[PDB]
């Protein structure tokens, strides 16, 4: 169902939250080799997350679930913001620039926290 696929998407999103917090600790500790691996894992998880979100939105469209489509359009828009910030964070890591990395890390936390109001509304609309 669209709802079980949303539950999987929610789980993959929580996996990313878990890995992101482990990465933040590693960055603070200066374990750059660990950060590199966590960043690669996060990219993989965001790819899978976005794939699930798109299939859910396309299915809500085919089902005519107008409230769900509206909410998912809003959420997938904010997901792109998070993606853009994550990409800039990765570039800052490649460049050896911890100041910018810190800033982007913090910004991505705020984009994600703000998104959770939408995420929970979608669950209840589907």
Chain residues in the site for ligand DEE (CB under 6 A): 13, 16, 46, 49, 78-79, 82-83, 86, 111-112, 115
Q: In the bound complex, what is the minimum distance in angstroms from residue 64's beta carbon to ligand DEE?
A: 25
Q: List the structure tokens of 21.
A: 């917090």
Give every CB contact of residue 34 below 8 A, 6+ residues apart in sequence: 23, 26
Point out the residue whose Cβ comes nearest to ligand DEE.
82
- Of the candidates 65, 63, 60, 104, the one whose C-alpha atom is nearest the C-alpha of residue 82 is 104
CA distance 27 to 3: 36
When the beta carbons of 26 and 104 are compared against ligand DEE, the nearer one is 104
Least distance from ligand DEE to the Cβ atom of residue 81, Å: 7
Q: Which C-beta is closer to ligand DEE: that of 26 or that of 46?
A: 46
Residue-by-residue DSSP string for 39-51: HHHHHHHHHHHHH
Which residue lies nearer to ligand DEE by CB, 38 or 79? 79
Distance (Å, rounded) from C-alpha 79 to C-alpha 74? 9
Of 34 and 111, the one with the shorter C-beta distance to ligand DEE is: 111
In the complex, minimum distance from the CB of residue 42 to ligand DEE, in angstroms, rounded to a whole number: 8
């Amino acid at each position: 169902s669209v709802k079980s696929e949303y539950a999987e998407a929610a789980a993959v999103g929580q996996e990313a939250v878990a890995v992101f917090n482990t990465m933040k600790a590693a960055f603070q500790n200066g374990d750059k080799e660990a950060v590199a691996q966590y960043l690669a894992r996060l990219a993989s998880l965001y790819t899978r997350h976005e794939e699930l979100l798109n299939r859910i939105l396309e299915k809500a469209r085919r089902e005519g679930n107008k409230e769900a489509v509206t909410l998912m359009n809003e959420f997938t828009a904010t997901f792109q913001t998070g993606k853009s910030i994550f990409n800039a964070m990765v570039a800052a890591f490649k460049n050896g620039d911890d100041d910018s990395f810190e800033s982007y890390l913090q910004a991505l936390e705020k984009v994600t926290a703000k998104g959770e109001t939408l995420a929970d509304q979608i669950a209840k609309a589907l």
